[PDB]
């Protein structure tokens, strides 16, 4: 007894759903549609409702946009009476700082309360087998609520916040070798952090959603090691072209 024969990994080739159903028809594998009343429940939205583009050089038509945001605040106050706009930017700093300290100690149980499900993979996936040492040295300029907008069954509200503060980052590889950054010297950062909260959900809260990347941002710090970007791996019959 206690016998199970397993074959080697198959590694399905086609990833797309269409090809799977396009190849399931050639193989006769019929997959009837599902039937269920229960559906999944998403606490966070997939993407931003209205794209924000920060003005260049920040590092009539303009006035109207500020009023549109004020209108959306009313919606956020219909579901939460005790909510002010002169405290959230001070509250976002606590979340932002507290959400980046969970990466040093690998506190993923509390990190879900601070960030959304759309943001959590982006932060943790790359550092799964890496050591991070992030700190908040000082704050340069106070934060400001640049834009507030809500969605048109559930309703979510997004609050864009601008941050300008110094930070220290040192990323170490699996083996403890320095991979990126310097633990001694901080640097200025200008990143617009977006938050989201499911107003409908009585247990909802404000959590980080994503980071706006402006096209006019300075290049990031260079990495320590070198890279090789190979060219086309041509076949014998095919020839190389300039």
């Amino acid at each position: 007894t206690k016998k199970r024969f397993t074959p080697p990994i198959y590694q399905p080739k086609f990833k797309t759903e269409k090809e799977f159903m396009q190849h399931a028809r050639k193989a006769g594998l019929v997959i009837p549609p599902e039937k269920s009343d229960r559906s999944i429940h998403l606490a966070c939205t997939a993407g931003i409702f209205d794209a924000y583009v920060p003005p260049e050089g920040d590092a009539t038509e303009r006035m109207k946009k500020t009023m549109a945001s004020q209108v959306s605040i009313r919606r956020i106050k219909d579901y939460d009476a005790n909510f002010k706009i002169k405290d959230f930017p001070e509250k976002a700093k606590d979340i932002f700082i507290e959400a980046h300290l969970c990466l040093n100690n690998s506190d993923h149980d509390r990190l879900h309360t601070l960030v959304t499900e759309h943001c959590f993979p982006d932060m943790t996936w790359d550092i799964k087998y890496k050591t991070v040492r992030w700190s908040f040295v000082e704050s340069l300029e106070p934060s400001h609520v640049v834009q507030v907008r809500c969605s048109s069954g559930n309703v979510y509200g997004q609050i864009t916040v601008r941050m300008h503060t110094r930070q220290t980052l040192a990323i170490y590889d699996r083996f403890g070798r320095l991979m990126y950054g310097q633990e001694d010297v901080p640097k200025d950062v200008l990143e617009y952090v977006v938050f989201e909260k499911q107003l409908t959900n009585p247990y909802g809260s404000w959590r980080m959603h994503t980071k706006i990347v402006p096209p006019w941002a300075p290049p990031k710090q260079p990495i320590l090691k070198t890279v090789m970007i190979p060219g086309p791996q041509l076949k014998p019959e095919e020839e190389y072209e300039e």
Binding site: T131, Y172, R174, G176, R177, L178
Partner: peptide, 8 residues
């Protein structure tokens, strides 16, 4: 390949 050594 999943063991993570402490920073040196």
């Amino acid at each position: 390949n999943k063991i993570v050594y402490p920073p040196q």
